[PDB]
Amino acid sequence: ENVSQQNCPICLEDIHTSRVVAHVLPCGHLLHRTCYEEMLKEGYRCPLCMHS
Numbered sequence: 796e797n798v799s800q801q802n803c804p805i806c807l808e809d810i811h812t813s814r815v816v817a818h819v820l821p822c823g824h825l826l827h828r829t830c831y832e833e834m835l836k837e838g839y840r841c842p843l844c845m846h847s
């Protein structure tokens with residue numbers, strides 16, 4: 796399984812290490828701008844913490 800290539804669990808979309816487009820969460824996770832709003836809206840436990 797291609798786990799070496801990251802994905803956005805916030806909405807099952809694509810994601811990459813480049814944080815110029817992807818906003819950095821203060822816990823070190825990346826998500827596209829809109830998804831930063833979506834996630835921060837909930838303030839829920841960051842699922843990305845399971846994958847690194």
Ligand SMILES: [Zn+2]
Binds near residue numbers: 803
């Ligand atoms: Zn997303």
Ligand SMILES: [Zn+2]
Binds near residue numbers: 822824841844
């Ligand atoms: Zn985290």
